[PDB]
């Protein structure tokens, strides 16, 4: 992914949550995909909105192509004061 990308910025909630699920990485033979988006959460109310099926390319400006699922999760957990995501819509 490099042609039609979307840059998303979201501030975490009171509990330090964004309201979205991730699947894949380097340890999993599948890219990082946003599997689920919870309603009324930062991921659901941000502009542009983070949608289900979006392929994650960057997390806070870092390339996560060679990173495992656990590392990807911990990188998102280190942006809590906003989370930056570069995704490919699907």
């Amino acid at each position: 992914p490099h042609d039609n990308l979307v840059l998303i910025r979201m501030k975490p909630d009171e509990n330090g949550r964004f309201g979205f699920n991730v699947k894949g990485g380097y340890d999993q033979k599948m890219p990082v995909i946003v599997s689920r988006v919870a309603p009324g959460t930062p991921a659901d109310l941000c502009v542009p909105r983070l949608n289900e099926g979006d392929q994650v390319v960057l997390i806070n400006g870092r390339d996560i192509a060679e990173h495992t699922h656990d590392q990807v999760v911990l990188f998102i957990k280190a942006s809590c004061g906003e989370l930056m995501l570069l995704v490919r819509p699907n």
Binding site: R17, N21, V22, K23, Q28, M30
Partner: peptide, 6 residues
């Protein structure tokens, strides 16, 4: 297939 909420 691992899934994690954030």
């Amino acid at each position: 297939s691992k899934e994690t909420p954030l």
